[PDB]
Enzyme design. Structure first.
Site, PDB file in Angstrom:
ATOM      1  N   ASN A 275       0.598  -1.363  -0.564  1.00  0.00           N
ATOM      2  CA  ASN A 275      -0.108   0.122   0.307  1.00  0.00           C
ATOM      3  C   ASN A 275       0.884   1.066   0.244  1.00  0.00           C
ATOM      4  OD1 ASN A 275      -1.436   1.875   0.303  1.00  0.00           O
ATOM      5  ND2 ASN A 275      -2.374   1.751   2.230  1.00  0.00           N
TER       6      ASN A 275
ATOM      7  N   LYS B 283       3.469   0.738   2.949  1.00  0.00           N
ATOM      8  CA  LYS B 283       2.807   0.365   3.781  1.00  0.00           C
ATOM      9  C   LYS B 283       2.548  -1.131   3.663  1.00  0.00           C
TER      10      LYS B 283
ATOM     11  N   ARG C 251      -2.424  -2.016  -3.344  1.00  0.00           N
ATOM     12  CA  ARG C 251      -3.948  -1.246  -3.247  1.00  0.00           C
ATOM     13  C   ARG C 251      -3.942  -0.549  -4.218  1.00  0.00           C
TER      14      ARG C 251
ATOM     15  N   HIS D 218     -12.725   3.026   0.411  1.00  0.00           N
ATOM     16  CA  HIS D 218     -13.284   2.187   1.953  1.00  0.00           C
ATOM     17  C   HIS D 218     -13.654   0.632   1.230  1.00  0.00           C
ATOM     18  CE1 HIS D 218     -13.019   5.871   4.736  1.00  0.00           C
ATOM     19  NE2 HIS D 218     -11.870   4.808   4.609  1.00  0.00           N
TER      20      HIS D 218
ATOM     21  N   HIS E  28     -17.537   1.802   8.446  1.00  0.00           N
ATOM     22  CA  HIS E  28     -16.259   1.511   8.589  1.00  0.00           C
ATOM     23  C   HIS E  28     -15.526   3.596   9.502  1.00  0.00           C
ATOM     24  CE1 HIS E  28     -12.094   1.217   7.005  1.00  0.00           C
ATOM     25  NE2 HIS E  28     -11.941   2.106   7.058  1.00  0.00           N
TER      26      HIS E  28
ATOM     27  N   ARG F 271     -11.051  15.902   8.386  1.00  0.00           N
ATOM     28  CA  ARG F 271     -12.203  16.234   7.382  1.00  0.00           C
ATOM     29  C   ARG F 271     -13.618  16.407   7.696  1.00  0.00           C
ATOM     30  NH1 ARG F 271     -11.009  11.038   5.199  1.00  0.00           N
ATOM     31  NH2 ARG F 271      -8.508  11.500   3.302  1.00  0.00           N
TER      32      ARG F 271
ATOM     33  N   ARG G 171      -9.896   8.393  21.521  1.00  0.00           N
ATOM     34  CA  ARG G 171      -8.689   8.429  22.906  1.00  0.00           C
ATOM     35  C   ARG G 171      -9.245   9.670  23.658  1.00  0.00           C
ATOM     36  NH1 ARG G 171      -3.758   6.285  20.481  1.00  0.00           N
ATOM     37  NH2 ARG G 171      -4.678   6.018  18.757  1.00  0.00           N
TER      38      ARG G 171
ATOM     39  N   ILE H   4     -12.144   3.216  14.776  1.00  0.00           N
ATOM     40  CA  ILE H   4     -13.314   3.839  15.800  1.00  0.00           C
ATOM     41  C   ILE H   4     -14.103   2.866  16.018  1.00  0.00           C
ATOM     42  CG2 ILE H   4     -15.294   5.156  16.359  1.00  0.00           C
ATOM     43  CD1 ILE H   4     -13.010   7.399  14.388  1.00  0.00           C
TER      44      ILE H   4
ATOM     45  N   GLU I 233     -14.136  -0.608  16.185  1.00  0.00           N
ATOM     46  CA  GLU I 233     -14.390  -1.737  16.399  1.00  0.00           C
ATOM     47  C   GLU I 233     -13.494  -1.608  17.955  1.00  0.00           C
ATOM     48  OE1 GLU I 233     -10.636  -3.487  14.264  1.00  0.00           O
ATOM     49  OE2 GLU I 233     -11.340  -2.402  12.401  1.00  0.00           O
ATOM     50  N   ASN I 234     -12.833  -0.348  18.680  1.00  0.00           N
ATOM     51  CA  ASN I 234     -12.204   0.343  19.393  1.00  0.00           C
ATOM     52  C   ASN I 234     -13.459   1.169  20.429  1.00  0.00           C
ATOM     53  OD1 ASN I 234     -10.436  -1.379  19.739  1.00  0.00           O
ATOM     54  ND2 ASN I 234      -9.572  -0.010  17.621  1.00  0.00           N
TER      55      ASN I 234
ATOM     56  N   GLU J 131      -9.007  -5.174   5.272  1.00  0.00           N
ATOM     57  CA  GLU J 131      -7.827  -4.498   4.204  1.00  0.00           C
ATOM     58  C   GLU J 131      -6.759  -5.709   3.102  1.00  0.00           C
ATOM     59  OE1 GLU J 131      -8.747  -1.324   5.761  1.00  0.00           O
ATOM     60  OE2 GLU J 131      -9.028  -0.791   3.766  1.00  0.00           O
TER      61      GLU J 131
HETATM   62  N1  GDP Z   1     -11.866   5.128  21.103  1.00  0.00           N
HETATM   63  C1  GDP Z   1     -11.191   4.408  21.190  1.00  0.00           C
HETATM   64  N2  GDP Z   1     -11.187   5.092  19.405  1.00  0.00           N
HETATM   65  C2  GDP Z   1      -9.895   4.592  18.914  1.00  0.00           C
HETATM   66  C3  GDP Z   1      -9.006   3.415  19.642  1.00  0.00           C
HETATM   67  N3  GDP Z   1      -8.022   3.171  18.704  1.00  0.00           N
HETATM   68  C4  GDP Z   1      -8.219   3.187  17.822  1.00  0.00           C
HETATM   69  N4  GDP Z   1      -9.088   4.815  17.843  1.00  0.00           N
HETATM   70  C5  GDP Z   1      -9.689   5.028  16.769  1.00  0.00           C
HETATM   71  O1  GDP Z   1      -9.836   4.849  15.070  1.00  0.00           O
HETATM   72  C6  GDP Z   1      -8.892   6.381  15.032  1.00  0.00           C
HETATM   73  C7  GDP Z   1      -7.679   5.047  13.849  1.00  0.00           C
HETATM   74  O2  GDP Z   1      -9.221   4.518  13.036  1.00  0.00           O
HETATM   75  P1  GDP Z   1      -7.912   3.602  11.899  1.00  0.00           P
HETATM   76  O3  GDP Z   1      -8.795   2.887  11.638  1.00  0.00           O
HETATM   77  O4  GDP Z   1      -6.773   2.728  11.960  1.00  0.00           O
HETATM   78  O5  GDP Z   1      -8.060   4.489  10.889  1.00  0.00           O
HETATM   79  P2  GDP Z   1      -7.123   5.200   9.781  1.00  0.00           P
HETATM   80  O6  GDP Z   1      -5.421   5.610  10.350  1.00  0.00           O
HETATM   81  O7  GDP Z   1      -7.601   5.657   9.122  1.00  0.00           O
HETATM   82  O8  GDP Z   1      -7.073   3.743   8.612  1.00  0.00           O
HETATM   83  C8  GDP Z   1      -8.172   6.798  15.566  1.00  0.00           C
HETATM   84  O9  GDP Z   1      -7.307   8.107  15.065  1.00  0.00           O
HETATM   85  C9  GDP Z   1      -8.235   7.064  16.768  1.00  0.00           C
HETATM   86  O10 GDP Z   1      -9.440   8.375  16.669  1.00  0.00           O
HETATM   87  C10 GDP Z   1      -9.460   2.644  20.728  1.00  0.00           C
HETATM   88  O11 GDP Z   1      -8.809   2.089  21.366  1.00  0.00           O
HETATM   89  N5  GDP Z   1     -10.601   3.596  21.855  1.00  0.00           N
END
Ligand code: GDP
Ligand code: GDP
Lengths: 394, 394
Positions: B8, B15, B83, B172, B200, B233, B277, B324, B326-327, B378
């Site tokens: 990627n 990556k 990708r 996505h 997503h 954004r 977070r 976001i 997932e967590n 992905e």
């Molecule tokens: N509340 C919470 N948010 C999280 C956690 N881990 C990641 N995030 C959020 O998810 C974002 C990263 O998600 P990701 O899928 O990797 O986004 P990407 O960088 O576009 O690939 C971060 O900017 C955080 O805002 C967590 O453990 N708890």
């Protein structure tokens, strides 16, 4: 037998109506079209298209003042209602016009430069000709002032909101409000425990979510450019796409401003007309681009209807209004069929009925949500506000 | 024991991941960060942050090629997955890379100039180092190619679509597709008769409506700027408001382009961070602007989820994914509570579970719609496409 004089000063016109206080019946309607042009005609009821040349907002109103006196109506004018395009954050309801109110309308005027200065010209004119007459201002935005910050904020940097006042305002508020009040009776709903979606569909079009009698979401933004695809307006458009267009065409923000506002929408896609009567017949005759414009129009209406429903705790009704919502059997059915996910069932015979049937249910009994058509009356709502404020002691 | 090498190439990074063919397990992961900069480091697994100075896309890939040979992996590389950010209208599925495919990716590259030329640089590099190895291109847009014209057209004049290719593409797609496939098993659904909404949620965020296994609506547009509010954004923004801003600040389309893309969203409103977070803990500590950024974020997610549901005949599931999705126990609950209108009931104990519990239902039994969290992969989807195309005779 007192009357209310309702005034709507547009960008190039003055649309007026005279309503009876006791019944809210229209006794006289007219339009002073082609304002600030060499050819400015005033056509009352259609009986006589009288003419004037290069005349200001006050001159067109002074023409009405003479015409009303000619028909012996002058002494009956108990109240005057003014339509205002933009009330900013300063106005949450209809108010009796004072020097304070004028100052405040002038303060929010940068939020809608074209329309608001025209509204003020109307106030100044009407105040001159009718000083002994109480005058009321009714705002297009005031109903949407009950929106929570999460619903009216843009994802822009906070600076733009606090410093410049960039936020969602939304419009058709007088219509959305009027149609809401009417829906509670028609659907036998308790206003305090209710969830409605009102689809105002005309040349300009907007959705509004009404939760417990209050506007909680609306599709138009700071300007009437956001939300639904409309007659000449694009509606929601990717800002990245707009910036991409600029690089290729060399066009500026202003260039694309006119395109999005005046050359897009139903007119833009079909390349035929902004009028739905034209496009519906074009599709029946197998016109491909007219069919797509209508399908796109319908798809974007359904998307925003379902989206606005998220701001409700329970969905009781979907109400159609405006020139399109009142008169288009086709668009209503297509929209409702596109919302089967919400459990809507249409009664086609009921949906077939023309606007002469007025406030009417168009959904079948086993539908989870009631669908209805309610003709909007912005003039009547303005008048009802004026009548209510006629009992006040200022 | 053959492996797939997944690549990627971003705007400033490469990556990569190495996955086992038999199990799709990650055996090695890494990132060549700070591309085209005087300080360009390659950090595999974290064990050694090796360094390079002012090196091209091919040089960073040639570093990987040496590292893989150092760990005796070179002979195991049976397939290579790439990708691609934008496949225009030319790509509807993952393809084995040929000279034709490269020409076609170069044709659609004006639709995403920054990202797509980086992807091509990766292809050219990987082809040099691994000529005897089959190579596959997987596009971010290809899944959304099943969108009907009414769903992908903008209300812009038809000229902009037919002549310039201005339309919704959405992104996505690899995630949305992967999560969809996984949801049919988890929810025991027949793919051919199903309606899903996939949210997503990461730094970049999008919704997608999957009807009968096919994407029928998605929130991102021609560019990743449309739809949901995101990390940096703004998401959906009134074009009239943007033009109004220009008149006051003297800013251009490009000036506001950067603002909307890099300075807005969660970062923009809170004025604190794009990271959730950070903001979640800030709100727990009573930070007002962080609370609003989250509420706005949630409100716009709920609105688009409900809106996208209109493109379905029946809503079976809502699936959360991304960093976001997932967590974040909080955002998920807030979104679901904002969608009570669709009849969603949350199981809070189930929603409390961290991502270690993987693919999991988070909704209560009497909920009309199933809610679930499914971790996106992905890299795995790219690999599964490459493995499938490994049986082909070209
Ligand atoms: N509340 C919470 N948010 C999280 C956690 N881990 C990641 N995030 C959020 O998810 C974002 C990263 O998600 P990701 O899928 O990797 O986004 P990407 O960088 O576009 O690939 C971060 O900017 C955080 O805002 C967590 O453990 N708890
Ligand atoms: N299908 C259909 N559409 C109509 C009819 N009458 C009006 N319309 C549509 O409604 C629009 C005018 O509605 P209106 O509420 O007056 O919009 P406004 O000009 O913004 O006030 C026209 O542009 C037509 O597209 C009708 O009888 N049938």
């Amino acid at each position: 037998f007192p009357v209310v004089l309702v005034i709507n000063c547009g960008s190039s016109s003055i649309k007026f109506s005279v309503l009876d206080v006791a019944t809210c019946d229209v006794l006289m309607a007219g339009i002073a079209d082609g304002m600030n042009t060499e050819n400015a005609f005033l056509s009352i009821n259609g009986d006589k298209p009288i003419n004037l040349a290069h005349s200001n907002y006050e001159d067109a109103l002074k023409a009405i003042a003479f015409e009303l006196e000619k028909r012996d109506l002058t002494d009956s004018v108990a109240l005057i209602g003014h339509r205002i395009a933009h009330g900013g954050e300063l106005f949450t309801q209809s108010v009796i016009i004072t020097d304070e109110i004028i100052d405040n309308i002038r303060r929010v005027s940068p939020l809608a430069p074209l329309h608001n200065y025209a509204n003020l010209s109307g106030i100044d004119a009407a105040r001159h000709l009718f000083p002994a007459v109480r005058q009321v201002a009714v705002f297009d935005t005031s109903f949407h002032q009950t929106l929570a910050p999460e619903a009216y904020l843009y994802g822009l940097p906070w600076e733009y909101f606090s410093s410049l006042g960039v936020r969602r305002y939304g419009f058709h508020g007088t219509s959305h409000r009027y149609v809401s009040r009417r829906a509670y009776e028609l659907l036998d709903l308790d206003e305090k425990d209710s969830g409605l979606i009102v689809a105002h569909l005309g040349n300009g079009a907007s959705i509004c979510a009404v939760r417990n009698g209050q506007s909680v979401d609306t599709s138009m933004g700071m300007t009437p450019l956001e939300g639904l695809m409309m007659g000449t307006r694009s509606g929601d458009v990717d800002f990245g796409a707009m910036a991409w267009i600029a690089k290729e065409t060399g066009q500026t923000l202003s260039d694309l401003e006119r395109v999005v506002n005046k050359e897009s929408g139903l007119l833009g896609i079909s390349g035929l007309s902004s009028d739905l009567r034209v496009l519906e017949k074009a599709w029946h005759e197998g016109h491909e681009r007219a069919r797509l414009a209508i399908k796109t129009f319908v798809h974007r209406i359904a998307r925003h209807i379902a989206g606005h429903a998220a701001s409700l705790h329970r969905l009781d009704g979907i109400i159609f209004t405006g020139g399109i919502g009142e008169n288009s059997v086709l668009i209503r059915q297509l929209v409702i069929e596109h919302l089967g996910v919400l459990g809507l069932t249409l009664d086609v015979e009921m949906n077939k009925q023309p606007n002469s049937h007025g406030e009417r249910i168009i959904s079948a009994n086993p539908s989870q949500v009631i669908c209805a058509v309610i003709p909007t009356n912005e003039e009547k709502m303005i008048a009802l506000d004026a009548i209510h404020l006629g009992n006040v002691k200022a």
